[PDB]
């Protein structure tokens, strides 16, 4: 279902950096500007997963979440062409801002992912990968009067598709019923709200992949966020068992109060 994009139509400019199994970089449609995301020469199995995310992202729409136009193909090039926001990801921008990002800022950006994740939820929609990397600053809010504004990415690659590797690299972020549902989401936004708290630097981060499996492995506790506006949110969605975590309506409605 997702939207065909003709070479002829995109102009390939700086590269931006790399996601999972893609190289990324700015561009211009017809004239847009957008981000073209190319997919590694791969096998079928990684390619569908590729055009599965850009069937379901067609097929969405919330003012935090962005937008995909479709799909290119230049060859062996899958392409995936997307909305450019203008300030990138999320956990770049903090890590660079850290100590001059208000506790307030931080709440704003919480309730804007959730109400997103809310609407998935309701269209019983799983994303696979809420991390800090995903969230992308349409406005900075930092200045008076203002209010930041997010937009949450595409997945990328599906979940399913990748490696056990990459799957442990995306620990603490990755489910831990996903290392051997839209569950799974709320897990990944428990991460990202420490993640968020902790100014771009994501716990377990420094660790090596089987320091990381053998977190899981043991079913450690992961750490409390810098601020206690979110330490009880946090705790009830990274708990392990799946079934035991809160709701996005939920999660929404109290942090909206
Ligand atoms: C997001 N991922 C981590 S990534 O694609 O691997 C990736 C990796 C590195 C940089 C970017 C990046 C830097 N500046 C952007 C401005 N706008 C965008 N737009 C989008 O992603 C919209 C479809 C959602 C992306 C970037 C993206």
Redesign the pocket.
């Given at each position: 279902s997702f939207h065909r994009v003709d070479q002829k139509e995109i102009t390939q400019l700086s590269h931006?950096?790399?996601?999972?199994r893609?190289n990324?970089y700015?561009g211009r449609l017809r004239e847009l500007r957008?981000?073209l995301?190319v997919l590694d020469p791969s096998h079928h199995d990684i390619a569908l997963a590729f055009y599965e995310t850009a069937s379901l992202?067609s097929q969405v729409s919330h003012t935090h979440?962005?937008?995909?136009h479709g799909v290119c193909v230049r060859g062996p090039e899958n392409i995936?062409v997307?909305?450019?926001?203008?300030?990138?990801?999320l956990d770049?921008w903090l890590r660079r801002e850290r100590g001059h990002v208000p506790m307030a800022w931080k709440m704003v950006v919480a309730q804007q992912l959730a109400s997103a994740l809310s609407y998935l939820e309701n269209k019983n929609l799983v994303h696979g990968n809420v991390?800090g990397?995903?969230i992308?600053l349409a406005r900075l809010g930092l200045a008076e009067g203002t209010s930041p504004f997010i937009?949450?990415?595409?997945p990328?690659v599906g979940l399913g598709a990748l490696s056990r590797e990459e799957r442990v690299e995306r620990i603490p972020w990755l489910a831990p019923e996903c290392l051997p549902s839209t569950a799974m989401d709320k897990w990944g936004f428990g991460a990202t709200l420490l993640e968020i708290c902790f100014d771009g630097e994501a716990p377990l981060q420094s660790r090596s992949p089987s320091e990381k499996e053998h977190f899981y492995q043991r079913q450690h506790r992961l750490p409390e966020p810098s601020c206690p506006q979110l330490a009880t949110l946090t705790s009830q969605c990274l708990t392990y068992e799946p079934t035991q975590r809160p709701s996005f309506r939920t999660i929404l409605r109290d942090l909206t109060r």
């Open positions: 931006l950096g790399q996601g999972t893609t990324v700015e957008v981000v995301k992202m979440l962005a937008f995909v995936m997307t909305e450019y926001v203008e300030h990138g990801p770049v991390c990397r995903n992308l937009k949450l990415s595409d990328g």
